[PDB]
Design a protein around this ligand. Sequence first.
Ligand SMILES: O=c1[nH]cc(F)c(=O)[nH]1
Ligand SMILES: [Zn+2]
Ligand SMILES: [Zn+2]
Ligand SMILES: [Zn+2]
Ligand SMILES: [Zn+2]
Lengths: 478, 478
Amino acid sequence: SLLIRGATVVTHEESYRADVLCANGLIQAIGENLETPSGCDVLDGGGQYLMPGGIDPHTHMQLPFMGTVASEDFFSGTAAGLAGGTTSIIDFVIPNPRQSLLEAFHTWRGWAQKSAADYGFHVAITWWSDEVAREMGELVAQHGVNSFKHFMAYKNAIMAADDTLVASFERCLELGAVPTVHAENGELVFHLQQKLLAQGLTGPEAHPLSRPPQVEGEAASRAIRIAETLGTPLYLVHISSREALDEIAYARAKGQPVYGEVLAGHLLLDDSVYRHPDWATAAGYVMSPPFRPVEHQEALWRGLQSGNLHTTATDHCCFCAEQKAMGRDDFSKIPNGTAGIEDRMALLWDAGVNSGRLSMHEFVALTSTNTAKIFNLFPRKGAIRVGADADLVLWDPQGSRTLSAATHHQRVDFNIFEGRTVRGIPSHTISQGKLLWAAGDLRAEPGAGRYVERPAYPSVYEVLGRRAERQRPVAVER
Amino acid sequence: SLLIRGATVVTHEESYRADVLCANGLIQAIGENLETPSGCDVLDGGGQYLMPGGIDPHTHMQLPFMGTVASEDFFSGTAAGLAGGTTSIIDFVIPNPRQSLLEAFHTWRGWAQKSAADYGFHVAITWWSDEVAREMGELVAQHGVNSFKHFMAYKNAIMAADDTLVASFERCLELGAVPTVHAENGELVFHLQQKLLAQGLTGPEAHPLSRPPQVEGEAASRAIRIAETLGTPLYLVHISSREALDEIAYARAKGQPVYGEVLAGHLLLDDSVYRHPDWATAAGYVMSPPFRPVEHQEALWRGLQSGNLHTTATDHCCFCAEQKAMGRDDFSKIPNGTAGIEDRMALLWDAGVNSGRLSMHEFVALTSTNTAKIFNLFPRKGAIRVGADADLVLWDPQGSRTLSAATHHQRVDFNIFEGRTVRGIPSHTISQGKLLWAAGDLRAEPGAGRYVERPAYPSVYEVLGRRAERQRPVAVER
Ligand SMILES: O=c1[nH]cc(F)c(=O)[nH]1
Ligand SMILES: [Zn+2]
Ligand SMILES: [Zn+2]
Ligand SMILES: [Zn+2]
Ligand SMILES: [Zn+2]
């Protein structure tokens, strides 16, 4: 067992002084001056905040992508997450077009076995067939999946057109699963990539130009309105643009259950990074959606503060310099993705809590609880309560960390926040009730993490069901 | 010649007392107390308003569509327009998929020869190839077309997917042509049509349900953001929804040249019409986009008042009861379209000017001048000035008319405003300087109308060109 003594418990709504006892993977007791069970380890949390461990619902450990394999694997990535206070991930099974979802799922389960912390999967719908629909049902019923990812870009690869989006969202409704979407208009991206290449703009600076913000705003609008028409919730991953945020807010204001995810990179970086004179440095920022003109960062922060963005994630998708350099002569061939799993919580704390943009409670909601609620893992995760999983982070508000690819635990040679110093850091991370990060000592072990099943029908589906029953079409008798 | 004496001239900006002299198809003189050329006819306009004749940029005379042919042909339609104060139309060449645009154009030119008033064409892009792109160039350079229509709905027929919209909008940019779009998400419409039919909901009441307002809002967003990304203006036909209006306003607020067209029906009717107990009556309202819940009418009115809707039109697409009954057992096969060319101006005047929603100058701007400006026909049309085409309407603000299919000149057995009495009517209509409608006497003649060419590169393309210049990508020196 593990007793965290003397900390201030900080949840998504309140703070209070209490000790927290963990045992058998679970939170066993909470209260002032808890008794210490015999042989129980005690962690002194005086002067620190005890919060739910971060949940990162958007990682791509060792993803085969754009001709290569992410340099971070499921062990190194979940270990780096733990060092950063993140205690569980939701990654992505991405079947190739025409590949069985179940085949890809089992393969990814093999890849993820080595995880050091709890992990789960969204499954991407990269093609459509009656068999895909059948496999979605088996994944939900047998394999603990309750969310299905759709890529609206990546034309001629994993892109889902409207017919697949409609069919899949309908299937999601039938299964009580959450559709999630990468919202970029793939036709416009493809068109602009070729146009820029044809003009000789082959450098990383052309990457943002090939997918300007309205391309994301458009696709967000479309996913949102498909979801509205079919009667599903919708989770939009990595929102980077005012245009997309405004579409989310516009939907939420019509009473539609639309959730927005945001990455620290898109809150804090602007598209000037792509004009760095060093090719490899500029290419290190290449991900989709790309980093945006500065006005979008303020809009996204406002989205967090207004409740129109709901979760934070990292799109953790690591490629080293030699991998990025696959696109040295063609930006469209730069494997897209940045690292972030280790850094998300401290970046958001430092930028959001220290500044007074976000309360500490909002920080908790945005780093674990909302993700848990949306994907039906609350209060198993994201909650400090008896019986919840003992995934916790002890936070030193006065601690300091300097982010650097030379010192981070992420198995990648680039950090998009290289040299940034943050105040407020995870001093300790507890996963499954075990102390896996302790003031610079990482004790992550390959294979320790559990695959986490997520039950279908999060409670939003109860409300939608009542709505649908109220708005049933009714023929006029003549 | 024809001298209109003693009226108040009302333009899109001002009112003033003056006589107007027409000769040789043109406005020859304007001023108080004009002298009368010898033998020139004199029309007494005392106590009336002399405005530019209405321009209806959205008609479908004798269109072959949904298994049949509109019951209004180019003569009966343009004649009925004259009776209602509308002096010119822009209709649509709609080539079948894989059909040559030039071939369809010359066919429509043949059908339109019988027009009684000036007429022009948009050309619809119902498929794509290098030849379509080549033919578009010829239509602009040789045949006076400067606007190309795209249907985002009507899947498996004339629907254009993103790949065609991108290629075609790009071509429009190259040609200085205005892209126009019918904005409904075709996949959602198709999906819902099949779902409603599968549920046994076959009546006209299922028609609005098969394409609710967000499917228009979505398609409007998409067309708008393709136009933004490619750098074109965009004209959205028959906006019916708050959702689509809000997308236009959003785009306009980003500095994008987006124009919105609205029909009287969508300003004044709600979707309850489709639940009428009489099947033929409900079917008479079946057009796309369909009439909408009440809140959308007030939104559209505000759009006109705020400058986010720019033109009025009718989508004049006439089918009689027996043609409508082609979908007696399947609403998806009711030929879509309503009549309106004769009624637009009176409807808008009575609902907009009498009520104080719109000034008389806004009425002129919305019934002729804005359409002329957008499609590069200003000041040849939509203008009371020396040298402009003598297309005029003399308006009796105290005159009354009751709209009825039994008495209108539109060759169709249904009027969506049956029984509505309007105050403010066209007493006289002048087209090419000739009195073709006079106090109940229609004098339209087959073949009298001229085909009206529209030059490419309306001034908006000058601004866009400077903008594109300012925004051209610069490679990073490495
Ligand atoms: O930047 C990215 N976008 C989408 C992905 F799937 C990924 O791995 N990286
Ligand atoms: Zn993505
Ligand atoms: Zn991703
Ligand atoms: Zn239309
Ligand atoms: Zn039409």
